[PDB]
Homo-oligomer: A and B are copies of this chain.
Amino acid sequence: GFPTELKPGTNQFLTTDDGVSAPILPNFHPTPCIHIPGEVRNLLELCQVETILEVNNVPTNATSLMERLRFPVSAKGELCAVFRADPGRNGPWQSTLLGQLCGYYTQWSGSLEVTFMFTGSFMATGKMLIAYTPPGGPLPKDRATAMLGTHVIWDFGLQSSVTLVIPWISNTTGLVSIWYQTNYVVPIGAPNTAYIIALAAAQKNFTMKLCKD
């Protein structure tokens, strides 16, 4: 008959092989699929959603785990908080869905987008400095050199939420620090401590490679 020979690599079972196999029920018709709302086709859509970034991952107590979702701002040129722009490595980025999906892959690259939300009284005013340092650069010694780099001056008397866009990351990492540009000024009868919530996400150009359990 038709002459063939078995090339090397036959009778092996590669667990990644995608060859089509024989159905167990040839005459079966599965129930036709209906339109269920909210269908996801690419996990990058689930990576492009803003998610709480536990910058204040200091406490571990069982009855106070809820205090990690936000970090306090209360009553001049001091340091509020600092965290690394490292979605996949251990740290605050473990909480976000982007940082959890980074654990299922080996390589990732793209631009981040971290927004902050101020949760103080409407009559509370003040300014805060959010500086980003490129990879390699150390933590700034003070606000004077923190302002020289890339930064935004965030006042929450006018705007209650600001966005800081990390230019580019890949799998040294960048640093994000937040400084007291001005003290916390509040009127009489309003609470003397406030909180800031960090929501982190990925831009449209984030991608992943080399899926790994």
Interface residues of A (CB under 8 A from B): 1-14, 16-19, 21-29, 209-211
Contact = CB atoms under 8 A, between A and B. Distances in A.
B4 A6 contact: yes
- Give the one of A7, A8, A28 with max B CB within 10 A: A7
A16 B26 contact: yes
Contacts of A14: 22, 24
A73 B160 CA distance: 81
B9 A3 contact: no
Contact of A17 (B4, B8, B209): B8
B9 A22 contact: yes
A207 to B, nearest CB: 10
21 contacts: A1-B5, A2-B5, A3-B7, A4-B4, A4-B7, A4-B10, A5-B6, A5-B7, A5-B9, A5-B10, A5-B12, A6-B6, A6-B11, A7-B19, A8-B17, A8-B19, A9-B22, A16-B24, A16-B25, A27-B211, A29-B209
A23 B210 CA distance: 14
A1 B6 CA distance: 9
A183 B205 CA distance: 75
A30 to B, nearest CB: 9
